[PDB]
């Protein structure tokens, strides 16, 4: 009966095994509850902490209540939903609580998920450069061009792209419609990197079934403004099981951090060795559970 909300379950598991998340929730719970001794956003922190406690006591030797908090903060969440969309709600309302509580560890979401992007545009006539700074919580990459590695997917996201034809860039220096090259580069790197694989497609909406060659260690340096010396590593993969984008069943796989992968199918847990799990992620295996969200933690 638990797996009826596998969009909220699977996200709750990555967050539970997210480096420094539970400590962040309990720090904000103390401040929240002490002020209560001395509103629906307050409920989310209280509801989350109770769920964190519930998993703890069982593991030592609730997903429904979290959903009622969401039904007030969000009208739709009262059906099958998108796992990544729920991630925004939990990670967004926590920061909203923080922004209120800080005014009254307060950087729970900003220091853990948010990052900085530099969006540079180069007109091809005057060769001038314009820059933009935008925050990002996840890197939404494509899966198919219209075997390919995650390096290719991020390159399609961040490497120099040339907008031409019907999508011409309006240059204010030239005062005319012009060809431009766009290159988004990461400036500030959070401790948790989420990569949202756009496994959906359009023609007629379908789900792309072939995954990319997901690597265990990823270096986001080639698309960084600075010569970085830091790499990233997989610690969680949320997968979607199905053949259509309108229905399915989400699963999660979080690395033990001892050194294995727990597989979270509804209410079951099945430990998998490092080599077998990586094998099951290869495109040649034809994985029935297409990877949807990939999470990397700083080493």
């Amino acid at each position: 009966n638990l797996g009826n909300t596998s969009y909220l379950n699977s996200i709750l598991q990555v967050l539970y095994f997210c480096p420094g998340f539970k400590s962040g929730v309990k720090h904000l719970f103390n401040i929240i509850s002490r002020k209560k001794e001395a509103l629906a956003s307050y409920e989310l922190i209280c509801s989350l902490q109770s769920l964190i406690i519930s998993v703890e006591q069982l593991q030592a030797s609730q997903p429904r209540r979290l959903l009622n908090t969401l039904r007030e903060l969000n009208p739709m969440y009262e059906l099958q939903h998108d796992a990544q969309e729920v991630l925004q709600c939990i990670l967004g309302n926590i920061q909203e609580t923080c922004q209120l509580l800080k005014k009254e560890g307060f950087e729970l979401v900003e220091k853990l998920f948010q990052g900085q992007l530099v969006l540079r545009t180069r007109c091809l006539e005057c060769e001038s450069l314009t820059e933009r700074r935008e925050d990002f919580q996840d890197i939404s990459v494509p899966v198919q061009e219209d075997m390919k590695t995650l390096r290719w997917a991020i390159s399609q996201f961040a490497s120099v792209e040339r907008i031409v034809g019907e999508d011409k860039y309006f240059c204010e220096n030239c005062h005319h419609y012009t060809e431009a090259e766009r290159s988004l580069l990461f400036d500030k790197m959070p401790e948790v990197i989420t990569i949202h694989l756009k496994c959906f497609a359009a023609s007629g909406l379908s789900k792309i079934n072939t995954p990319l060659l997901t690597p265990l260690k990823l270096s986001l340096e080639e698309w960084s403004t600075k010569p970085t010396n830091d790499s990233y590593g997989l610690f969680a993969v949320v997968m979607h099981s199905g053949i259509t984008i309108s229905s399915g069943h989400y699963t999660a796989s979080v690395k033990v951090t001892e050194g294995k992968w727990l597989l979270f199918d509804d209410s079951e847990v099945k430990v998998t060795e490092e080599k077998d799990f990586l094998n099951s992620l290869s495109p040649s295996t034809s994985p029935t559970s297409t990877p949807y969200l990939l999470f990397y933690k700083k080493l």
Binding site: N4, T5, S6, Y7, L79, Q80, H81, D82, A83, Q84, E85, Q88, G92, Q114, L119, T121, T130, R132, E134, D135, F136, Q137, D138, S140, V141, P142, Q144, E145, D146, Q156, F157, E161, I163, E166, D167, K168, Y169, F170, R182, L184, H196, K198, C199, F200, A201, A202, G204, L205, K207, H240, S241, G242, I245, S246, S247, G248, H249, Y250, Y292
Partner: protein, 77 residues
Amino acid sequence: SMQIFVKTLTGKTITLEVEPSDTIENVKAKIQDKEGIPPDQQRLIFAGKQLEDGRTLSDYNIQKESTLHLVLRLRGG
């Protein structure tokens, strides 16, 4: 009035001519005209925040050259 970029499902970037007072419904309608995706299937993410229907671009401080990310919903349960 101002031009904003949208990164489609394949990573290809398209451009939209929008007003600061334009609502998210209007922006999603323009994206359909270029991409052929119904507005109810579209999710627009700007600066990590999802654009909610009924709000305006001035509410989210979307200025010229601002980049929106277009994603769909992958429902599961």
